[PDB]
Amino acid sequence: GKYNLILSEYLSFIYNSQSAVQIPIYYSSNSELENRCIEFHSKCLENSKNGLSLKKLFVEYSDVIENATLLSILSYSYDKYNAVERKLVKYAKGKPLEADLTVNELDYENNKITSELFPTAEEYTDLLMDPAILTSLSSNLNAVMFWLEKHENDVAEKLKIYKRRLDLFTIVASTVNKYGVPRHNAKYRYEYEVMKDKPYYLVTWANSSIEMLMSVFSHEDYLIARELIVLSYSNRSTLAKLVSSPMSILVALVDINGTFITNEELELEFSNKYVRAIVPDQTFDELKQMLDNMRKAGLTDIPKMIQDWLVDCSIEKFPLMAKIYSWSFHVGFRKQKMLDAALDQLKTEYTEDVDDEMYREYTMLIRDEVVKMLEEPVKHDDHLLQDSELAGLLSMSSASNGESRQLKFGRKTIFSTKKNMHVMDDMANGRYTPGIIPPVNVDKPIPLGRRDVPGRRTRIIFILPYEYFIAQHAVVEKMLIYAKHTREYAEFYSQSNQLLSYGDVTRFLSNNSMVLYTDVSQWDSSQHNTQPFRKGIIMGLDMLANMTNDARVIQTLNLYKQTQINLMDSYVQIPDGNVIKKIQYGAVASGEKQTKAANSIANLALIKTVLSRISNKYSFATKIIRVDGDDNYAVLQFNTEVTKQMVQDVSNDVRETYARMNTKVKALVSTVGIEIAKRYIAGGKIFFRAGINLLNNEKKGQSTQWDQAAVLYSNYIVNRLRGFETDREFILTKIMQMTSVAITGSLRLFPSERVLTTNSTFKVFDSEDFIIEYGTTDDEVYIQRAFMSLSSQKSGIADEIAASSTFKNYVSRLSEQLLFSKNNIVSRGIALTEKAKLNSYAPISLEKRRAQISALLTMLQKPVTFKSSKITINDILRDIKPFFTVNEAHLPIQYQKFMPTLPDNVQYIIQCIGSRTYQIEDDGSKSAISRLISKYSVYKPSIEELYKVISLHENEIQLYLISLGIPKIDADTYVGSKIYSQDKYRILESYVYNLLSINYGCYQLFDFNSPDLEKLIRIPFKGKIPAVTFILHLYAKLEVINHAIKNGSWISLFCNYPKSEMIKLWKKMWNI
């Protein structure tokens, strides 16, 4: 309830004119007050529409000011062009900045003038520095200047923040004012004709610098920001890659004193174990060279902080490192060219000096792993291998990007890259031919996509046809669904938390063992991911083919095999001007159904093969190896105690034993820590990388101005929890500026906190961070009922595509691969399901969402609507709340910190109740009926459809099950058992279980099975209504936790809930 005051001050500051007028609009769920709001509205518009002073009425209608709820504020203000400079000249009295063109290796990666690199606009491209966000730099500057203006009279630590950010913003505004501000077009692009006389990389530098200086709260933050902002203006290729590299060594220097553990059964369990840090001597010399590069690039204060920290190697000063490790990735992306980014990967050194003893074992281990994965389904003759074709055609992801193509649906032309639409096209013209796999050769090389991420290389993406997916689908699904019952993969270690993705950095650590951890992200072009990998899988397929007798399965397996045959020789379309290059690349990357598990397999075989060579010089027992695609760590335990020389020699042996296979590596051995791209542990404490650029994006999505405010707030929340903290007021300023909409050149509307923070399809943020909010009042109920009525909208483009011939044909062809006695129950169902993935096509989503926003605006302008009773969640919570009773409590501190970078209130909760004892309610459609259909088919009929289908007679249900391949005897047994009344109740239990509101970012981490939280929740037991008592206890926990987060103190609760309200609520439970 504070946002709106900052909104008012922002409006007053930005416009400032006599002509700038401000027009509230209100609402109330109470008839009389609502009609008085209507009145107020009318009279205000009239008075505005009559050149009368508006300031007189504002006293008379005090009632609206006290009890009504705000929606929005309108604004009539004229063009007033160029006001940014007219404000900004004062905050720019320092000296501007000069680039240094002789820093980056390439020529165009320097921050030189555009015209020196792009004389013609026809060859200009903003894609090498595109912020890719529908908000301007001028917007960012306006926000910064307003913040600076309002914080112009404070005298505290706040003033030290203001002086620091003022000096930084002076450096920035000095750099911009040297030339001026670029002006956005309607699309938020920056054309050639504005950037012609300015540096090419000024905008990204500006945005990133704003993001950094808005995240300054201390002196060391100021040092970091001044030392990165002045070098990120020139260096754009060797900065985040440089400073983020030493961290991998630093983790091997932090003594553990107190630890968190994880079980095989995936539960945290703290340990007071102490572990030293047996670091060798030569890695310090490496680290010094890295700091020498750091100083040689032009960094002075931040080497000083890393060198004076090593005098003590304490863990209390250590979050600084983590802080630094996050300050590197908030400088922007290194959006270089498709060509040179591919050539970062497409440099190869293949040699006739490697072993053969290694590759043969490698091939065999891959073979064996494949057989372990595939023994059960290949043998027991599973439907999904038999019906692999249909399985892949249902699971066609509708963003999949195979080969842009000119289509026509009746009377249109479409340039879709989506493979579902391509399949719809190819079914009609007789070209659908999944058994005949296309080649990938000179006659048909592959396109590319570009994956950028700061501090690392630009990675590449294959863009394949749609036959390869269909071939790979069934086998890879059985592989995943097997190996998540098994070690060595992220599918087994993943839900949200600690006790997961790693969960065994910290069992097998002491002064007996070590751990070798290794980044393997460059190992895609390597000589060990070519021929042996493919031939190993091919051999395994031969074994598995001889391990079955049915013929569709042999066909599917032979097609997967032939896919690996064709992918063994693979060329790559890349244009360059007029001519087209195609390069020999017979190796592995993503853009495939297979890449994750197969890379994990190959790395597993590789590390298992390497690890049988250290045994020639050491005695150890391998306790654990873990592989998640392109990373790997192995722990190993010894017959004796560890030394510095053994770690060093082991590292050299690892490096040279990879060198024997012509494989580059930075071998890293340690005792307490690891480092990988996204996270790391030091001293038995998990930190994380907070490298999510807010004001600069990777690529250009398809969302609106609106939703980008929500993504930016989500990234803010994440980065804040991770450690990187930005000023929340700035984020709110951006949200209002991005939800602002131009109805004309001079009319502009601004919504309020009570529209953006309400649970709907229009939610953007929350009134109190780290807490979703619900509604006990009339008013949230009112607007939620209103907005739920409006979420359901239409798309004429979708309507005409779904009314064409190819869509009908597609449903029919899907159908005819199965039985032919259901025509109005599933064909409509499959069409309704395909509709859920036609919306991926951007113009459909844009039509629907622009229509949705227009429907919103035609009740933001004029008064509001009651929406006719359509029930939602807050209706229920409104009835649950008035039988609670609070009392002040006092919990002690008995739980350990193991995520230091969190805010102190969240940590205080962790420091008073426990971290996660994880639970499960359903691992997907478990109840009675989908685990039969998923055994005889793959089809996934929606629970709406089942809730209807069970309500029908038992005859056409019997027909429907027989139509899905099932025999008659099991249907007869199902009807005789009388389970349909049970699966009504199980399905409605599953409907209440669909409430996903346990995992938003702060509820993600808290343990609700705690005894300390539970003794506060004194709700007596009634019985025979499990859903209600479940949700009541859950909701009471959420009340306690949210009060704790927002206020720190604790409370107890009590709900002597009447039986009458249990029953009155029971019918609204299992609806909506």
């Binding site: 027991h380 039969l932 055994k935 005889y936 099932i966 025999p967 005897i969 099991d970 047994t973 058992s977 389970i979």
Partner: peptide, 22 residues
């Protein structure tokens, strides 16, 4: 009633006999 489907009856009928013959 957990798992009174077909396709496992066949699996067991096939598995038992093929094991006892092999």
């Amino acid at each position: 009633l957990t798992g009174i489907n077909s396709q496992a009856a066949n699996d067991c009928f096939k598995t038992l006999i093929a094991a006892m013959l092999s």
